[PDB]
Amino acid sequence: IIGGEFTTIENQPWFAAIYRRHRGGSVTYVCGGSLISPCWVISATHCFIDYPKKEDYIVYLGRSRLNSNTQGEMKFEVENLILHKDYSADTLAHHNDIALLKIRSKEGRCAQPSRTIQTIALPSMYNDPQFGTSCEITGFGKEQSTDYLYPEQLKMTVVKLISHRECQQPHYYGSEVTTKMLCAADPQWKTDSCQGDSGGPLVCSLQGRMTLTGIVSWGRGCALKDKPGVYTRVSHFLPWIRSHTKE
């Protein structure tokens, strides 16, 4: 997250931290995700596509820090890693960038709700906030495009939704953006998602309910003029989510 503010998991308790074990034993952060039911985390396919084997991954819930344990956190294996079959990569503009991780502890159990671990509601089909609406994004991604390190403490920021009409302009993204994607940015371009925020939640309040409106997917650079963040539009994948969460 470029700009924005440090936070703790109490403020985004559906946030899932996803890591990969390397042969040799090294573990590294991969991507964010969102808990949508006790056994299911939703994320982005591009985070996993190069390394699709479920045994490589570890998922934490209730975690506020990247490389330190948070009191009350829970650690899970990935029982199933489901990637979208119509995923594609075109320069950077990923189509159908959505994935499901079925989680299971060493004890064989799913998530247990607490102050630090909660689910996020999904939107109704084709029901998104009006453009110009403010939404939140959360992650452990870079704080500056030039940074090497990820922040050790979770961050969040606010961005505003941008219409497809505006995003499809040539000086924004042209044909790279589809109606299955949502763009969002800051009016001053001073805050944005960045590398390592992929798979994380874009949350908007719709009819008095906090709703998973989008999933961090791609963008050209970060916090650059005329180059918004691009998010998978969750309200266009409800049938896909519903079928695959019975696997």
């Binding site: 991507c31 985070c47 590398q195 798979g199 997917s217 791609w218 963008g219 970060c222 963040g229």
Partner: peptide, 12 residues
Amino acid sequence: CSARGLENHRMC
């Protein structure tokens, strides 16, 4: 490779 879309990729 320094931005969103290429996390956990074999090239990067």
